[PDB]
């Protein structure tokens, strides 16, 4: 028998997109979610596959230094990475492939080796992008509510709460995670992060974890310390850029960053950083929501007090925004799975860089402040006491609790499937 000759490999975009909840992403390239089967159809130019004669082996690789030990390379025969025949007709062979639910996310190249007992011939079948899979029970990001998966993964428009505890407002926001080119930009963001630049092979392996990815994104959304997206500015002078209040969605920001060679975009503030992080994380398939905290404290000396010095100082903000992302935490003691707070707005350094989280919101509520990452900082944002050091005419300083301004009020995120505000204060702090 002569060797097989491949005409083309059909990546079955329409069917895969629908099944994998990636239809908007699959206009031009295959995008699938890990842990779940997808279809491919091979078209042969002479004879078809014959099981008695042909042995077919598949190989997948991601990133610049793939290896089987790191999970960034796998080899598997047509019989966790698997391939099986589903149909055979004239010149075509219909296959189903499956990936592990813990596979590193990103761009893979898929190849085929074919043999009839002598020399093998190799073909590149194409590329696909593998994403987190909130529909898959074995995936760390599994979320067992369809209405919540719709909200926190698939919906591209939401609302962000702003203003003050006394005067709540909101703006609409276009997350736009499935608009053309955005996924490509998300992968660029991962591929220019400092951990990649330092050890690409390790970084690519570690992208199996939503914890690692979440932490990476919290750092890369701000331009501080790295090649990240946004420059913050707070002094009301935005003439040489875009005012933070002008943006209506994330896509203009991410396109601007890409188009100028990963140059910082001017300008953002909290809700801008949070919204862009939400876009990136929803895009990669991690269920994510934007949260607003009113009277949001910035503790500068980790003592869980907000200290003001007054006549005969740390700051509290009218509001602050960050994101929560849904995942298990196998890096912690059991019980901390669910919503994790991630904060891309530069405030305090974490191990020398401007990143923050992920921290289980549950750890914040229960005061388990040794729980990684950055639990004391986030605890103080929502539950610090305010102390006034008031100088007395006699020269002494009286320390008093100020109860006029309470830290951490009316914590808010958009309601699932409706244009209304959900109060989630109860998830961060017990009532007193």
């Amino acid at each position: 028998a002569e060797e097989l000759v491949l005409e083309r490999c059909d990546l079955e975009l329409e069917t895969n997109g629908r099944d994998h909840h990636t239809a908007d992403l699959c206009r031009e390239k295959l995008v699938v979610r890990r842990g779940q089967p997808f279809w491919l159809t091979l078209h042969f130019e002479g004879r078809n596959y014959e099981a008695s004669v042909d042995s077919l082996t598949f190989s997948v690789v991601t990133g610049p230094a793939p290896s089987q030990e790191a999970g960034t390379k796998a080899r598997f025969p047509l019989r966790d990475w698997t391939a099986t025949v589903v149909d055979q007709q004239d010149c075509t062979l219909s296959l189903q492939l499956t990936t592990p639910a813990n596979a590193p996310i990103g761009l893979y190249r898929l190849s085929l080796e074919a043999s009839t007992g002598y020399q093998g011939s190799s073909f590149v079948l194409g590329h696909f992008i593998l994403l987190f899979n909130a529909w898959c029970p074995a995936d760390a990001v599994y979320l067992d509510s369809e209405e919540e998966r719709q909200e926190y993964v698939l919906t591209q428009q939401g609302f962000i709460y702003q203003g003050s505890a006394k005067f709540i407002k909101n703006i609409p926001w276009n997350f736009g995670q499935f608009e053309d080119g955005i996924l490509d930009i998300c992968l660029i963001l991962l591929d220019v992060n400092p951990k990649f630049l330092k050890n690409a092979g390790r970084d690519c392996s570690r992208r199996s974890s939503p914890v690692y990815v979440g932490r990476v994104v919290s750092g890369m959304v701000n331009c501080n310390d790295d090649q990240g997206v946004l420059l913050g500015r707070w002094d009301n002078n935005y003439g040489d850029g875009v005012s933070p209040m002008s943006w209506i969605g994330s896509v203009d920001i991410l396109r601007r960053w890409k188009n100028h060679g990963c140059q910082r975009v001017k300008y953002g503030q909290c809700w801008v950083f949070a919204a862009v992080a939400c876009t990136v994380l929803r895009c990669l398939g991690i269920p994510t929501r934007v949260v607003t905290n009113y009277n949001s404290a910035h503790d500068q000396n980790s003592n869980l007090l907000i200290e003001y010095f007054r006549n005969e100082s740390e700051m509290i903000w009218n509001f602050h925004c960050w994101v929560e992302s849904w995942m298990t935490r196998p890096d912690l003691q059991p019980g901390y799975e669910g919503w994790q707070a991630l904060d891309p707005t530069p405030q305090e350094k974490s191990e020398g860089t401007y990143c923050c989280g992920p921290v289980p919101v549950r750890a914040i509520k229960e005061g388990d402040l040794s729980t990684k990452y950055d639990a004391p900082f986030v605890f103080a944002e929502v539950n610090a006491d305010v102390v006034d050091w008031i100088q007395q005419d006699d020269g002494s300083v009286h320390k008093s609790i100020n109860r006029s301004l309470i830290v951490g009020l009316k914590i808010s995120t958009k309601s699932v499937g409706r244009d209304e505000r959900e109060d989630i204060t109860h998830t961060y702090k017990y009532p007193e």
Binding site: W234, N236, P244, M245, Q269, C270, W271, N295, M315, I316, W317, N318, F319, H320, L405
Partner: peptide
């Protein structure tokens, strides 16, 4: 904008 009280 975000404003420090």
């Amino acid at each position: 904008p975000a404003x420090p009280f």
